[PDB]
């Protein structure tokens, strides 16, 4: 049981055309976990797409995708599907499938490699960059409104160069197993901030804060902070 | 069709495992601890689970036939219909008070007498082997002089026999009894859901001793009148939780935030490790606020 | 006008409580004299949510009492079921106080909260509600025997017997005890309920309490509305929009209409029996009462029943 | 002695106001629902308005909604109608009448009336009937689903000049003091009064009356003049 998500079906698609991505799971009983699709325009930030519960009872869509994409799962074939219709340049991204896991307040704890979709022939506010020196401490801040951070919990993902993101923080200030206590999260009002102490050069990564948004009834993300270590 | 919660103050509502007034709220002693009650179980869209009955008048009751001079109570339904073991730990309303002896009172139905006291006292040890409600019978502690059709209740509880001096513990349920491929089909366990949230229990008192000499308090996940509403309303679920306010009815000041989950249980976030809903007044009312997320963050309850 | 639409709980009658004792409803009955009146003090709620008499909200508070008694004595000084004081002219009796007339009450009660570690907490005793010291409206009743240990007792009527010192009268659950006072507006009893006229008779919901009676027959207590109905109205508080609420008694298997009934704002139900030997007492118990429409006190109902082969 | 006495009506003119009173004695005013029924000279009975014992339930005729409001003071044992913005159509004898539970709240007791003068039907009956003495005569009453179709038909007998008296309640019951020559019946949306063994003293104006669910009020026949030859 190697716990694994693998996406496929990407490629070059014409504008106005359709495409159906798959996401094959192995190493964990698929039917017990909510699944998401998160996309990423190359070199831009994380955009949550769609969200589907264990028995497909709770299905959510991003507004930029409402009416055009369709999430489904076949629990028999350990599969998550994203049917994409009426495609356009805006949809060009790497598409990640990710698994919610309860022990970390259903944060996305296991991601796939992604599949690129090329169509051819933001709400949470973060500092765009931030820098520190080895040993020093830096605070990536992150500001929302009353319908996301004001109502819901803040999560922090970190992403090394050209790799899938990694759950850093859940429940505003808790860490998954394996996340060192240099990282600490905090939330007050419609704002949250991530604090990294004893900074090391491996911490060089983009850092994203996420929160549910009852206004949109879907997830919302920060623009991403590029932490640079010198 | 719009989801609603009965507009009555908690002080006027009934426990849903014993038919007695609610005396307060509290947390389980281990706040991460799971429970698996068979009574007081109902989805908020109105499906009852386990042995749960519609009305308090059938809560924590049993009915069956017993032969004169004998100890074995052959269970029926409280109306005398036979008990089919179909998805059901025991007849409707049968007690789920585990980990204690049940000192019972019963009487024949219908009455046919013209004098004397019709009430009969007796006892049950639910940890005893022949305690097999799921297989339609429990064995009483004393013989019963006059056979007949008896309907009765738990009159008082005491610490459980043959437990090596264990205490009463109303967080547990009995063993309903099983045989080969004849397993009882229980209402599943209730879990704290994460997000700092602990389950709120509603406490009522039943008579009987316990080793600490303290009140004899039975927890439950909802007031019975909430369950009966749901069974009647069958309002569709429209969110991962129903956010509720415990509102002071006199002042409109709302006294705490709660998430009521589809599965029929209610949670809060406790303020400090000592506090929680224990300190809330009993004359507040629960009012549906809105549909919310798994990820809604409750303002904590306590001082 | 206020217009929130009227609803009756959608549960079959088999599963609901009596509103005078906390026991499941076993049937519907007419009063032995279909012109006679009742003055039950439980099961008394307007259909717009206003409870009368001593009617409590919950079955858990029904046919129950609570008071202090000093050890050695027989006088129970009543409070409300939750401990809070019952003031001596606040009502006919504390909320949920029993209202079964023409019978001895044989009661069971325990000290609350629990303080014990061994022994049996249950004390049995009895009341004679026709006695002179039975003054619940003055906040005290007198038990028949002494209570060895004094404290805070809560208890219920455990079984009934025909009323002593009554000339050998039989148990009669159609009557209520003598209690209450005219000396204050609050201490006055919920009023009698009479058949409205119009050939209509009052429909009662029957349940069973243990007890010997003079005929060796069921010991059945009548009430006017199932308690769950009463608790529903207290929550809903639907506006009364006509002098009478038309109801159909529905077989939910087919949603067939088994007959018309009028539900009056005062909190009681009537129909017109097909004949002197028929009536709602023949109907199945697994049916459901459904609001149809608001009507007149002059609405002419289709009769309910039949009897042949 | 049981009695209602009405006052305060007389020779007003349009746009004006008038407060009628009605005084009860011989019975507990507070224990009774009360109506106003008016009667234009030579025309039929028109139910005006109605107030319940503790004033909780109040109903008006469609043609006085806006201008009349009923009221009672059970202490001073009086019923009131303050009539405002009066027009000529409001010219009649205004009777106050009491509803009696033992006759299904038919109006058992009427006062003598008070005349309001001003200057500057839904149930259908025959206008007249006639019969030779000892004959049987029947009078028909016909209405619709919202009155006779749903509710009990009552019958009033009004003697030459006299205030009315209740003849039949509940389709066919007879109050205390009504001969069995008078029987009543109803069928669907129709009703009929039958007088057998006709007597000269039976010469009167006969009215049928039912509650109309649409109008949320009482509704009267046009009245039948029975002439006894």
mmCIF file with all atom_site columns, N, CA and C in Angstrom, chain D residues 139-199:
data_model
loop_
_atom_site.group_PDB
_atom_site.id
_atom_site.type_symbol
_atom_site.label_atom_id
_atom_site.label_alt_id
_atom_site.label_comp_id
_atom_site.label_asym_id
_atom_site.label_entity_id
_atom_site.label_seq_id
_atom_site.pdbx_PDB_ins_code
_atom_site.Cartn_x
_atom_site.Cartn_y
_atom_site.Cartn_z
_atom_site.occupancy
_atom_site.B_iso_or_equiv
_atom_site.pdbx_formal_charge
_atom_site.auth_seq_id
_atom_site.auth_comp_id
_atom_site.auth_asym_id
_atom_site.auth_atom_id
_atom_site.pdbx_PDB_model_num
ATOM 1   N N  . UNK D 1 139 ? -91.389  25.987 1.045  1.00 0.00 ? 139 UNK D N  1
ATOM 2   C CA . UNK D 1 139 ? -90.596  27.108 0.570  1.00 0.00 ? 139 UNK D CA 1
ATOM 3   C C  . UNK D 1 139 ? -89.185  26.611 0.313  1.00 0.00 ? 139 UNK D C  1
ATOM 4   N N  . UNK D 1 140 ? -88.661  26.903 -0.864 1.00 0.00 ? 140 UNK D N  1
ATOM 5   C CA . UNK D 1 140 ? -87.332  26.439 -1.218 1.00 0.00 ? 140 UNK D CA 1
ATOM 6   C C  . UNK D 1 140 ? -86.285  27.502 -0.908 1.00 0.00 ? 140 UNK D C  1
ATOM 7   N N  . UNK D 1 141 ? -85.076  27.039 -0.593 1.00 0.00 ? 141 UNK D N  1
ATOM 8   C CA . UNK D 1 141 ? -83.931  27.905 -0.333 1.00 0.00 ? 141 UNK D CA 1
ATOM 9   C C  . UNK D 1 141 ? -82.760  27.313 -1.088 1.00 0.00 ? 141 UNK D C  1
ATOM 10  N N  . UNK D 1 142 ? -82.095  28.116 -1.914 1.00 0.00 ? 142 UNK D N  1
ATOM 11  C CA . UNK D 1 142 ? -81.033  27.599 -2.765 1.00 0.00 ? 142 UNK D CA 1
ATOM 12  C C  . UNK D 1 142 ? -79.825  28.522 -2.708 1.00 0.00 ? 142 UNK D C  1
ATOM 13  N N  . UNK D 1 143 ? -78.655  27.922 -2.530 1.00 0.00 ? 143 UNK D N  1
ATOM 14  C CA . UNK D 1 143 ? -77.418  28.667 -2.499 1.00 0.00 ? 143 UNK D CA 1
ATOM 15  C C  . UNK D 1 143 ? -76.300  27.908 -3.171 1.00 0.00 ? 143 UNK D C  1
ATOM 16  N N  . UNK D 1 144 ? -75.076  28.172 -2.739 1.00 0.00 ? 144 UNK D N  1
ATOM 17  C CA . UNK D 1 144 ? -73.930  27.595 -3.418 1.00 0.00 ? 144 UNK D CA 1
ATOM 18  C C  . UNK D 1 144 ? -73.055  26.783 -2.476 1.00 0.00 ? 144 UNK D C  1
ATOM 19  N N  . UNK D 1 145 ? -71.889  26.393 -2.990 1.00 0.00 ? 145 UNK D N  1
ATOM 20  C CA . UNK D 1 145 ? -71.001  25.488 -2.272 1.00 0.00 ? 145 UNK D CA 1
ATOM 21  C C  . UNK D 1 145 ? -70.505  26.101 -0.970 1.00 0.00 ? 145 UNK D C  1
ATOM 22  N N  . UNK D 1 146 ? -70.242  27.403 -0.972 1.00 0.00 ? 146 UNK D N  1
ATOM 23  C CA . UNK D 1 146 ? -69.649  28.051 0.188  1.00 0.00 ? 146 UNK D CA 1
ATOM 24  C C  . UNK D 1 146 ? -70.647  28.343 1.303  1.00 0.00 ? 146 UNK D C  1
ATOM 25  N N  . UNK D 1 147 ? -71.963  28.231 1.049  1.00 0.00 ? 147 UNK D N  1
ATOM 26  C CA . UNK D 1 147 ? -72.947  28.373 2.112  1.00 0.00 ? 147 UNK D CA 1
ATOM 27  C C  . UNK D 1 147 ? -73.602  27.032 2.322  1.00 0.00 ? 147 UNK D C  1
ATOM 28  N N  . UNK D 1 148 ? -74.825  26.797 1.817  1.00 0.00 ? 148 UNK D N  1
ATOM 29  C CA . UNK D 1 148 ? -75.594  25.585 2.118  1.00 0.00 ? 148 UNK D CA 1
ATOM 30  C C  . UNK D 1 148 ? -74.771  24.328 1.888  1.00 0.00 ? 148 UNK D C  1
ATOM 31  N N  . UNK D 1 149 ? -73.880  24.357 0.889  1.00 0.00 ? 149 UNK D N  1
ATOM 32  C CA . UNK D 1 149 ? -73.100  23.173 0.550  1.00 0.00 ? 149 UNK D CA 1
ATOM 33  C C  . UNK D 1 149 ? -72.189  22.702 1.667  1.00 0.00 ? 149 UNK D C  1
ATOM 34  N N  . UNK D 1 150 ? -71.765  23.628 2.546  1.00 0.00 ? 150 UNK D N  1
ATOM 35  C CA . UNK D 1 150 ? -70.776  23.366 3.591  1.00 0.00 ? 150 UNK D CA 1
ATOM 36  C C  . UNK D 1 150 ? -71.311  23.525 5.013  1.00 0.00 ? 150 UNK D C  1
ATOM 37  N N  . UNK D 1 151 ? -72.406  24.247 5.205  1.00 0.00 ? 151 UNK D N  1
ATOM 38  C CA . UNK D 1 151 ? -72.779  24.690 6.536  1.00 0.00 ? 151 UNK D CA 1
ATOM 39  C C  . UNK D 1 151 ? -74.264  24.460 6.759  1.00 0.00 ? 151 UNK D C  1
ATOM 40  N N  . UNK D 1 152 ? -74.657  24.457 8.025  1.00 0.00 ? 152 UNK D N  1
ATOM 41  C CA . UNK D 1 152 ? -76.050  24.187 8.390  1.00 0.00 ? 152 UNK D CA 1
ATOM 42  C C  . UNK D 1 152 ? -76.993  25.327 7.986  1.00 0.00 ? 152 UNK D C  1
ATOM 43  N N  . UNK D 1 153 ? -78.190  24.963 7.531  1.00 0.00 ? 153 UNK D N  1
ATOM 44  C CA . UNK D 1 153 ? -79.211  25.946 7.169  1.00 0.00 ? 153 UNK D CA 1
ATOM 45  C C  . UNK D 1 153 ? -80.123  26.176 8.365  1.00 0.00 ? 153 UNK D C  1
ATOM 46  N N  . UNK D 1 154 ? -80.362  27.444 8.683  1.00 0.00 ? 154 UNK D N  1
ATOM 47  C CA . UNK D 1 154 ? -81.279  27.904 9.714  1.00 0.00 ? 154 UNK D CA 1
ATOM 48  C C  . UNK D 1 154 ? -82.487  28.551 9.049  1.00 0.00 ? 154 UNK D C  1
ATOM 49  N N  . UNK D 1 155 ? -83.592  28.632 9.787  1.00 0.00 ? 155 UNK D N  1
ATOM 50  C CA . UNK D 1 155 ? -84.798  29.265 9.260  1.00 0.00 ? 155 UNK D CA 1
ATOM 51  C C  . UNK D 1 155 ? -85.401  30.203 10.297 1.00 0.00 ? 155 UNK D C  1
ATOM 52  N N  . UNK D 1 156 ? -85.672  31.436 9.884  1.00 0.00 ? 156 UNK D N  1
ATOM 53  C CA . UNK D 1 156 ? -86.297  32.428 10.747 1.00 0.00 ? 156 UNK D CA 1
ATOM 54  C C  . UNK D 1 156 ? -87.729  32.667 10.293 1.00 0.00 ? 156 UNK D C  1
ATOM 55  N N  . UNK D 1 157 ? -88.646  32.760 11.265 1.00 0.00 ? 157 UNK D N  1
ATOM 56  C CA . UNK D 1 157 ? -90.032  33.181 11.044 1.00 0.00 ? 157 UNK D CA 1
ATOM 57  C C  . UNK D 1 157 ? -90.217  34.585 11.602 1.00 0.00 ? 157 UNK D C  1
ATOM 58  N N  . UNK D 1 158 ? -90.642  35.527 10.741 1.00 0.00 ? 158 UNK D N  1
ATOM 59  C CA . UNK D 1 158 ? -90.913  36.919 11.123 1.00 0.00 ? 158 UNK D CA 1
ATOM 60  C C  . UNK D 1 158 ? -92.404  37.196 10.970 1.00 0.00 ? 158 UNK D C  1
ATOM 61  N N  . UNK D 1 159 ? -93.088  37.376 12.095 1.00 0.00 ? 159 UNK D N  1
ATOM 62  C CA . UNK D 1 159 ? -94.511  37.633 12.078 1.00 0.00 ? 159 UNK D CA 1
ATOM 63  C C  . UNK D 1 159 ? -94.797  39.052 11.594 1.00 0.00 ? 159 UNK D C  1
ATOM 64  N N  . UNK D 1 160 ? -96.001  39.289 11.025 1.00 0.00 ? 160 UNK D N  1
ATOM 65  C CA . UNK D 1 160 ? -96.410  40.640 10.615 1.00 0.00 ? 160 UNK D CA 1
ATOM 66  C C  . UNK D 1 160 ? -95.947  41.758 11.537 1.00 0.00 ? 160 UNK D C  1
ATOM 67  N N  . UNK D 1 161 ? -94.918  42.495 11.087 1.00 0.00 ? 161 UNK D N  1
ATOM 68  C CA . UNK D 1 161 ? -94.303  43.606 11.806 1.00 0.00 ? 161 UNK D CA 1
ATOM 69  C C  . UNK D 1 161 ? -93.285  43.239 12.876 1.00 0.00 ? 161 UNK D C  1
ATOM 70  N N  . UNK D 1 162 ? -93.469  42.062 13.480 1.00 0.00 ? 162 UNK D N  1
ATOM 71  C CA . UNK D 1 162 ? -92.681  41.558 14.607 1.00 0.00 ? 162 UNK D CA 1
ATOM 72  C C  . UNK D 1 162 ? -91.202  41.380 14.218 1.00 0.00 ? 162 UNK D C  1
ATOM 73  N N  . UNK D 1 163 ? -90.340  41.310 15.241 1.00 0.00 ? 163 UNK D N  1
ATOM 74  C CA . UNK D 1 163 ? -88.960  40.876 15.079 1.00 0.00 ? 163 UNK D CA 1
ATOM 75  C C  . UNK D 1 163 ? -88.934  39.365 14.863 1.00 0.00 ? 163 UNK D C  1
ATOM 76  N N  . UNK D 1 164 ? -87.896  38.846 14.205 1.00 0.00 ? 164 UNK D N  1
ATOM 77  C CA . UNK D 1 164 ? -87.904  37.427 13.818 1.00 0.00 ? 164 UNK D CA 1
ATOM 78  C C  . UNK D 1 164 ? -87.777  36.486 15.011 1.00 0.00 ? 164 UNK D C  1
ATOM 79  N N  . UNK D 1 165 ? -88.143  35.235 14.786 1.00 0.00 ? 165 UNK D N  1
ATOM 80  C CA . UNK D 1 165 ? -87.859  34.177 15.747 1.00 0.00 ? 165 UNK D CA 1
ATOM 81  C C  . UNK D 1 165 ? -87.268  32.987 15.002 1.00 0.00 ? 165 UNK D C  1
ATOM 82  N N  . UNK D 1 166 ? -86.334  32.290 15.655 1.00 0.00 ? 166 UNK D N  1
ATOM 83  C CA . UNK D 1 166 ? -85.703  31.116 15.064 1.00 0.00 ? 166 UNK D CA 1
ATOM 84  C C  . UNK D 1 166 ? -86.724  29.985 14.911 1.00 0.00 ? 166 UNK D C  1
ATOM 85  N N  . UNK D 1 167 ? -86.890  29.474 13.680 1.00 0.00 ? 167 UNK D N  1
ATOM 86  C CA . UNK D 1 167 ? -87.781  28.353 13.373 1.00 0.00 ? 167 UNK D CA 1
ATOM 87  C C  . UNK D 1 167 ? -87.059  27.008 13.334 1.00 0.00 ? 167 UNK D C  1
ATOM 88  N N  . UNK D 1 168 ? -85.916  26.948 12.648 1.00 0.00 ? 168 UNK D N  1
ATOM 89  C CA . UNK D 1 168 ? -85.185  25.709 12.425 1.00 0.00 ? 168 UNK D CA 1
ATOM 90  C C  . UNK D 1 168 ? -83.702  26.013 12.525 1.00 0.00 ? 168 UNK D C  1
ATOM 91  N N  . UNK D 1 169 ? -82.983  25.220 13.311 1.00 0.00 ? 169 UNK D N  1
ATOM 92  C CA . UNK D 1 169 ? -81.526  25.232 13.330 1.00 0.00 ? 169 UNK D CA 1
ATOM 93  C C  . UNK D 1 169 ? -81.062  23.862 12.882 1.00 0.00 ? 169 UNK D C  1
ATOM 94  N N  . UNK D 1 170 ? -79.807  23.781 12.432 1.00 0.00 ? 170 UNK D N  1
ATOM 95  C CA . UNK D 1 170 ? -79.188  22.503 12.066 1.00 0.00 ? 170 UNK D CA 1
ATOM 96  C C  . UNK D 1 170 ? -80.019  21.758 11.017 1.00 0.00 ? 170 UNK D C  1
ATOM 97  N N  . UNK D 1 171 ? -80.399  22.470 9.957  1.00 0.00 ? 171 UNK D N  1
ATOM 98  C CA . UNK D 1 171 ? -81.189  21.893 8.874  1.00 0.00 ? 171 UNK D CA 1
ATOM 99  C C  . UNK D 1 171 ? -82.633  21.553 9.247  1.00 0.00 ? 171 UNK D C  1
ATOM 100 N N  . UNK D 1 172 ? -82.857  20.848 10.395 1.00 0.00 ? 172 UNK D N  1
ATOM 101 C CA . UNK D 1 172 ? -84.178  20.283 10.667 1.00 0.00 ? 172 UNK D CA 1
ATOM 102 C C  . UNK D 1 172 ? -84.561  20.160 12.136 1.00 0.00 ? 172 UNK D C  1
ATOM 103 N N  . UNK D 1 173 ? -83.738  20.593 13.083 1.00 0.00 ? 173 UNK D N  1
ATOM 104 C CA . UNK D 1 173 ? -84.145  20.622 14.480 1.00 0.00 ? 173 UNK D CA 1
ATOM 105 C C  . UNK D 1 173 ? -85.089  21.789 14.738 1.00 0.00 ? 173 UNK D C  1
ATOM 106 N N  . UNK D 1 174 ? -85.959  21.627 15.733 1.00 0.00 ? 174 UNK D N  1
ATOM 107 C CA . UNK D 1 174 ? -86.966  22.633 16.057 1.00 0.00 ? 174 UNK D CA 1
ATOM 108 C C  . UNK D 1 174 ? -86.735  23.183 17.450 1.00 0.00 ? 174 UNK D C  1
ATOM 109 N N  . UNK D 1 175 ? -86.550  24.488 17.622 1.00 0.00 ? 175 UNK D N  1
ATOM 110 C CA . UNK D 1 175 ? -86.354  25.026 18.974 1.00 0.00 ? 175 UNK D CA 1
ATOM 111 C C  . UNK D 1 175 ? -87.543  24.712 19.877 1.00 0.00 ? 175 UNK D C  1
ATOM 112 N N  . UNK D 1 176 ? -87.337  24.930 21.179 1.00 0.00 ? 176 UNK D N  1
ATOM 113 C CA . UNK D 1 176 ? -88.417  24.727 22.138 1.00 0.00 ? 176 UNK D CA 1
ATOM 114 C C  . UNK D 1 176 ? -89.522  25.723 21.852 1.00 0.00 ? 176 UNK D C  1
ATOM 115 N N  . UNK D 1 177 ? -90.693  25.211 21.493 1.00 0.00 ? 177 UNK D N  1
ATOM 116 C CA . UNK D 1 177 ? -91.835  26.050 21.199 1.00 0.00 ? 177 UNK D CA 1
ATOM 117 C C  . UNK D 1 177 ? -92.187  26.211 19.739 1.00 0.00 ? 177 UNK D C  1
ATOM 118 N N  . UNK D 1 178 ? -91.712  25.327 18.867 1.00 0.00 ? 178 UNK D N  1
ATOM 119 C CA . UNK D 1 178 ? -92.008  25.393 17.444 1.00 0.00 ? 178 UNK D CA 1
ATOM 120 C C  . UNK D 1 178 ? -92.776  24.132 17.073 1.00 0.00 ? 178 UNK D C  1
ATOM 121 N N  . UNK D 1 179 ? -94.020  24.257 16.615 1.00 0.00 ? 179 UNK D N  1
ATOM 122 C CA . UNK D 1 179 ? -94.809  23.084 16.222 1.00 0.00 ? 179 UNK D CA 1
ATOM 123 C C  . UNK D 1 179 ? -94.114  22.182 15.207 1.00 0.00 ? 179 UNK D C  1
ATOM 124 N N  . UNK D 1 180 ? -94.450  20.899 15.276 1.00 0.00 ? 180 UNK D N  1
ATOM 125 C CA . UNK D 1 180 ? -93.903  19.912 14.361 1.00 0.00 ? 180 UNK D CA 1
ATOM 126 C C  . UNK D 1 180 ? -94.483  20.008 12.965 1.00 0.00 ? 180 UNK D C  1
ATOM 127 N N  . UNK D 1 181 ? -95.463  20.893 12.748 1.00 0.00 ? 181 UNK D N  1
ATOM 128 C CA . UNK D 1 181 ? -95.890  21.203 11.389 1.00 0.00 ? 181 UNK D CA 1
ATOM 129 C C  . UNK D 1 181 ? -94.724  21.745 10.587 1.00 0.00 ? 181 UNK D C  1
ATOM 130 N N  . UNK D 1 182 ? -93.824  22.473 11.252 1.00 0.00 ? 182 UNK D N  1
ATOM 131 C CA . UNK D 1 182 ? -92.613  23.001 10.633 1.00 0.00 ? 182 UNK D CA 1
ATOM 132 C C  . UNK D 1 182 ? -91.504  21.943 10.646 1.00 0.00 ? 182 UNK D C  1
ATOM 133 N N  . UNK D 1 183 ? -91.185  21.413 9.480  1.00 0.00 ? 183 UNK D N  1
ATOM 134 C CA . UNK D 1 183 ? -90.015  20.573 9.335  1.00 0.00 ? 183 UNK D CA 1
ATOM 135 C C  . UNK D 1 183 ? -89.092  21.229 8.318  1.00 0.00 ? 183 UNK D C  1
ATOM 136 N N  . UNK D 1 184 ? -87.822  20.874 8.393  1.00 0.00 ? 184 UNK D N  1
ATOM 137 C CA . UNK D 1 184 ? -86.821  21.455 7.525  1.00 0.00 ? 184 UNK D CA 1
ATOM 138 C C  . UNK D 1 184 ? -85.937  20.378 6.942  1.00 0.00 ? 184 UNK D C  1
ATOM 139 N N  . UNK D 1 185 ? -85.369  20.689 5.785  1.00 0.00 ? 185 UNK D N  1
ATOM 140 C CA . UNK D 1 185 ? -84.514  19.735 5.113  1.00 0.00 ? 185 UNK D CA 1
ATOM 141 C C  . UNK D 1 185 ? -83.503  20.499 4.285  1.00 0.00 ? 185 UNK D C  1
ATOM 142 N N  . UNK D 1 186 ? -82.408  19.813 3.983  1.00 0.00 ? 186 UNK D N  1
ATOM 143 C CA . UNK D 1 186 ? -81.345  20.339 3.159  1.00 0.00 ? 186 UNK D CA 1
ATOM 144 C C  . UNK D 1 186 ? -80.843  19.210 2.280  1.00 0.00 ? 186 UNK D C  1
ATOM 145 N N  . UNK D 1 187 ? -80.390  19.590 1.098  1.00 0.00 ? 187 UNK D N  1
ATOM 146 C CA . UNK D 1 187 ? -79.977  18.636 0.087  1.00 0.00 ? 187 UNK D CA 1
ATOM 147 C C  . UNK D 1 187 ? -78.919  19.333 -0.756 1.00 0.00 ? 187 UNK D C  1
ATOM 148 N N  . UNK D 1 188 ? -77.665  18.912 -0.614 1.00 0.00 ? 188 UNK D N  1
ATOM 149 C CA . UNK D 1 188 ? -76.608  19.512 -1.404 1.00 0.00 ? 188 UNK D CA 1
ATOM 150 C C  . UNK D 1 188 ? -76.431  20.995 -1.138 1.00 0.00 ? 188 UNK D C  1
ATOM 151 N N  . UNK D 1 189 ? -76.678  21.842 -2.143 1.00 0.00 ? 189 UNK D N  1
ATOM 152 C CA . UNK D 1 189 ? -76.669  23.291 -1.972 1.00 0.00 ? 189 UNK D CA 1
ATOM 153 C C  . UNK D 1 189 ? -78.075  23.883 -1.848 1.00 0.00 ? 189 UNK D C  1
ATOM 154 N N  . UNK D 1 190 ? -79.056  23.091 -1.436 1.00 0.00 ? 190 UNK D N  1
ATOM 155 C CA . UNK D 1 190 ? -80.413  23.601 -1.337 1.00 0.00 ? 190 UNK D CA 1
ATOM 156 C C  . UNK D 1 190 ? -81.100  23.137 -0.052 1.00 0.00 ? 190 UNK D C  1
ATOM 157 N N  . UNK D 1 191 ? -82.154  23.850 0.308  1.00 0.00 ? 191 UNK D N  1
ATOM 158 C CA . UNK D 1 191 ? -82.859  23.580 1.542  1.00 0.00 ? 191 UNK D CA 1
ATOM 159 C C  . UNK D 1 191 ? -84.334  23.875 1.318  1.00 0.00 ? 191 UNK D C  1
ATOM 160 N N  . UNK D 1 192 ? -85.156  23.404 2.235  1.00 0.00 ? 192 UNK D N  1
ATOM 161 C CA . UNK D 1 192 ? -86.562  23.660 2.063  1.00 0.00 ? 192 UNK D CA 1
ATOM 162 C C  . UNK D 1 192 ? -87.211  23.636 3.425  1.00 0.00 ? 192 UNK D C  1
ATOM 163 N N  . UNK D 1 193 ? -88.116  24.597 3.634  1.00 0.00 ? 193 UNK D N  1
ATOM 164 C CA . UNK D 1 193 ? -89.014  24.620 4.776  1.00 0.00 ? 193 UNK D CA 1
ATOM 165 C C  . UNK D 1 193 ? -90.381  24.122 4.323  1.00 0.00 ? 193 UNK D C  1
ATOM 166 N N  . UNK D 1 194 ? -90.991  23.281 5.152  1.00 0.00 ? 194 UNK D N  1
ATOM 167 C CA . UNK D 1 194 ? -92.293  22.700 4.863  1.00 0.00 ? 194 UNK D CA 1
ATOM 168 C C  . UNK D 1 194 ? -93.208  22.977 6.043  1.00 0.00 ? 194 UNK D C  1
ATOM 169 N N  . UNK D 1 195 ? -94.337  23.615 5.761  1.00 0.00 ? 195 UNK D N  1
ATOM 170 C CA . UNK D 1 195 ? -95.365  23.869 6.752  1.00 0.00 ? 195 UNK D CA 1
ATOM 171 C C  . UNK D 1 195 ? -96.579  23.059 6.339  1.00 0.00 ? 195 UNK D C  1
ATOM 172 N N  . UNK D 1 196 ? -96.941  22.088 7.169  1.00 0.00 ? 196 UNK D N  1
ATOM 173 C CA . UNK D 1 196 ? -98.128  21.278 6.969  1.00 0.00 ? 196 UNK D CA 1
ATOM 174 C C  . UNK D 1 196 ? -99.183  21.705 7.979  1.00 0.00 ? 196 UNK D C  1
ATOM 175 N N  . UNK D 1 197 ? -100.439 21.377 7.686  1.00 0.00 ? 197 UNK D N  1
ATOM 176 C CA . UNK D 1 197 ? -101.518 21.810 8.556  1.00 0.00 ? 197 UNK D CA 1
ATOM 177 C C  . UNK D 1 197 ? -101.545 23.317 8.735  1.00 0.00 ? 197 UNK D C  1
ATOM 178 N N  . UNK D 1 198 ? -101.858 24.035 7.661  1.00 0.00 ? 198 UNK D N  1
ATOM 179 C CA . UNK D 1 198 ? -101.637 25.468 7.615  1.00 0.00 ? 198 UNK D CA 1
ATOM 180 C C  . UNK D 1 198 ? -102.675 26.198 8.454  1.00 0.00 ? 198 UNK D C  1
ATOM 181 N N  . UNK D 1 199 ? -102.233 27.231 9.168  1.00 0.00 ? 199 UNK D N  1
ATOM 182 C CA . UNK D 1 199 ? -103.098 28.027 10.038 1.00 0.00 ? 199 UNK D CA 1
ATOM 183 C C  . UNK D 1 199 ? -102.954 29.511 9.713  1.00 0.00 ? 199 UNK D C  1
#
